[PDB]
């Protein structure tokens, strides 16, 4: 029916008018009298050497010391950051891995990729070896991202244009999040783990209610595929990173974009995005083989974490906020501080 | 000034390091191939000659080959094709009998997309033109002019064989960085593995010249 298509357009117009109405002053205008952060001089403290292929993903533990990393070699390595020691090395059934996660408790790790399977690994056994606990199957497409809520719950994004919540014990999808019209690329839990946001190749980000299983809000602005997403520490905003070589800041309550982080010299897309503990810095990996640091309130470049030889694939900040880990296609993680 | 337990934890790290290096050496002594094709255009039959992803193993003349078929992966290629940046070669399959089945043009559209992909600048392509027997029976029935109206030559197998070959090789733009090895395979063959071996040998030589600095 044509009416339905028209009625949709009328509602889209209404939403646009509503979000235009509450737009009164820009973040730039408010953040004019604050002083700049200065020049952010970070140096490489550690270089974690071991992977023999392009590193695709990494994730910190909650302890803010251990971190897991994933590579196309077909290995998860768990590092001790302080000592540059390898704690576990896990051989993977599929070498094609595009994501990995570390449980908050620190008892489990997850990974997945072109196998279309999220594999859970029990780290703490009596036998003293890391074994596969569960292989979660159901997704039709490549597993793009995964993040634990609990020891028994994990949420995954996949190229099949869906996100799914799992009950690890039973190994079944509890609820499926449907809405996107492109390969869902990145995922970010809210602090309270009651909501999460997902960025897809449809150049759109969506807010999900974990419990009810529905799209609460949809965010548009990016011109190209959103490759990275991360939640602001407050939990009332989030930052995306796309192929149009811009990062953007969205707030949930006003339901619109606030700030854009663009520089004319920068033309390559963003791989990865993360915030500082305060949320005053917004770190972003790029395809030009260097990470940049943005004043999240002013939108001025504050520093450059240049060091890697190849694409900065993944980027993570500790919970204590003490350090930054940057994995790359040069098969090295560098820990900055 | 390490403590007793710290030193033992280092010893463990070293053993992990050792076993990682060994697994790497083993991986380096293996040929990795990517298999692409317009639907089922003789990808199955050449696999016999030798779900997200399917992996095949075959050894020939003391050289192990790993062949990855990504047919089941029904998603935007651009978002994962960069994973296979570093494969030794790309085997491409085209059904020569699917010229009148448009599909040939779709195969051509897929071919040039892979050939002129930023990731596969210096990645050789081992094109197989499958189903030549049926094509020889098809050309005498239905002409090639349906597929290629610019084809002015006589509707014979020998001429059309060379013509279609030329079409695909013309799609290649980077003629210096990489090479294309073409072969007319069929269902009743036993020398297709040999043709891959010859082609891969050439790719190894080139990589050997890169390491020495000659190239």
């Amino acid at each position, epitope marked *: 029916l044509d009416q339905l298509r028209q009625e949709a357009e009328q509602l889209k117009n209404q939403i646009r008018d509503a979000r235009k109405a509450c737009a009164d002053a820009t973040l730039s205008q408010i953040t004019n009298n604050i002083d700049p952060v200065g020049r952010i001089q970070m140096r490489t403290r550690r270089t974690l050497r071991g992977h023999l292929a392009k590193i695709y993903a990494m994730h910190w533990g909650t302890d803010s*010391r*251990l971190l897991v990393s994933a590579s196309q070699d077909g290995k998860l390595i768990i590092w*001790d950051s302080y*000592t540059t*020691n390898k*704690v*576990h090395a896990i051989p993977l059934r599929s070498s094609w891995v595009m994501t990995c996660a570390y449980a908050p408790s620190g008892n489990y790790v997850a990974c997945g990729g072109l196998d279309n399977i999220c594999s859970i690994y029990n780290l703490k056994t*009596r*036998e*003293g*070896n890391v074994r596969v606990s569960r292989e979660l199957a159901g997704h039709t497409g490549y597993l793009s991202c995964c993040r634990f809520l609990d020891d028994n719950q994990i949420v995954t994004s996949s190229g099949d244009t869906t996100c799914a919540l799992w009950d690890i014990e039973t190994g079944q999808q509890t609820t499926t999040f449907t809405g996107h019209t492109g390969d869902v690329m990145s995922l970010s839990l809210a602090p309270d783990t009651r909501l999460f946001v997902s960025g897809a190749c449809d150049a759109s980000a969506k807010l999900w209610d974990v419990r009810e299983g529905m799209c609460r809000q949809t965010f548009t602005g990016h011109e190209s595929d959103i490759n990275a997403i991360c939640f602001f520490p407050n939990g009332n905003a989030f930052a995306t990173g796309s192929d149009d070589a811009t990062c953007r800041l969205f707030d949930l309550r006003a339901d619109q974009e606030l700030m854009t982080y663009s520089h004319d010299n920068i033309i390559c897309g963003i791989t990865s995005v993360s915030f500082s503990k305060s949320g005053r810095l917004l770190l972003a990996g790029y395809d030009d083989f260097n990470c940049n640091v943005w004043d999240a309130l002013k939108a001025d470049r504050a520093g450059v974490l240049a060091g890697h030889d190849n694409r900065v694939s993944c980027l993570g900040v500790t919970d204590d906020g003490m350090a930054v880990a940057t994995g790359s296609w040069d098969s090295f993680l560098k820990i900055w501080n | *000034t390490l*403590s*007793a*337990e*710290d030193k*033992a*934890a280092v*010893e*463990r790290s070293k*053993m992990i390091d050792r076993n990682l290096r060994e697994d790497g050496e083993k991986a380096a002594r293996e040929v990795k191939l990517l298999l692409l094709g317009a639907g089922e255009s003789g990808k199955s039959t050449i696999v016999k000659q030798m779900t997200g992803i399917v992996e095949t193993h075959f050894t020939f003349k003391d050289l192990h080959f790993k062949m990855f078929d990504v047919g089941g992966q029904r998603s935007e290629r651009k978002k994962w094709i960069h994973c296979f940046e570093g494969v030794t070669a790309i085997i491409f399959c085209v059904a020569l009998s699917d010229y009148d089945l448009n599909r040939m043009h779709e195969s051509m559209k897929l071919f040039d997309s892979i050939c002129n992909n930023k990731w596969f600048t210096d990645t050789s392509i081992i094109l197989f033109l499958n189903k030549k027997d049926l094509f020889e029976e098809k050309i005498k029935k239905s002409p090639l002019t349906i597929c290629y109206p610019e084809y002015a030559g006589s509707n014979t197998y020998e001429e059309a064989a060379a013509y279609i070959q030329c079409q695909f090789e013309d799609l290649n733009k980077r003629k210096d960085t990489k090479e294309i090895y073409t072969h007319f395979t069929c269902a009743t063959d036993t020398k297709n593995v040999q043709f891959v071996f010859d082609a891969v040998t050439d790719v190894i030589i080139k990589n050997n010249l890169k390491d020495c600095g000659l190239f």
Partner: single-chain antibody
Amino acid sequence: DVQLVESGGGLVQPGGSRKLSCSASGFAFSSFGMHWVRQAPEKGLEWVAYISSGSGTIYYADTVKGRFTISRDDPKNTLFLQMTSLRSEDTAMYYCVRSIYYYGSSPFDFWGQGTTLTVSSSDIVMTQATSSVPVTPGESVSISCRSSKSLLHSNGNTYLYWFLQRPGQSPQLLIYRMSNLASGVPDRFSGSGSGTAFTLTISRLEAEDVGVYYCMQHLEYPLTFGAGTKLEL
């Protein structure tokens, strides 16, 4: 199901030789440093020898150095102790203990059942002042272990362990690195202390808690145990 069965014990004539064999089943024996720990008929525990994963590091006690030799056969999952020139001192039950060392591991976790050997006729001194203390089921008790040297390291790990040997059983790990409680141990057990002072506080005394409580340092080799405090009543 983790188990370590030792064999090769009996009556040996003095100045002889005997080999012990500790067969392993139900864990990755390859990736576990192994220890030997003796116990004389009516005395506490005494560490003997260690061999790391990879057989790349070996240590011995000063009483056995030269005489005893430790070796492992990873394919067959068996540990060996080739003893030579046996003395009337060596008469002891020999236990076979596993230990894994990485960040946040639990060393000295599982002990074997042991084998009885009978021979016919700079070290850190751990001190438990209390030899025995009577207790009432339901109450709380505290065990005290002192040290000659501060077991706190610069990294910030106080390497002090606690063990329990119930009557007619093998020692069981309770607490590792002063505070961290071991798996399969009730929360009633708790451990705290300083550099040299240590205290194991047991609450809600159970009838199964009766036994001897040892304290062991793992700051530096040789690894030294205390005298042991026996709970009773």
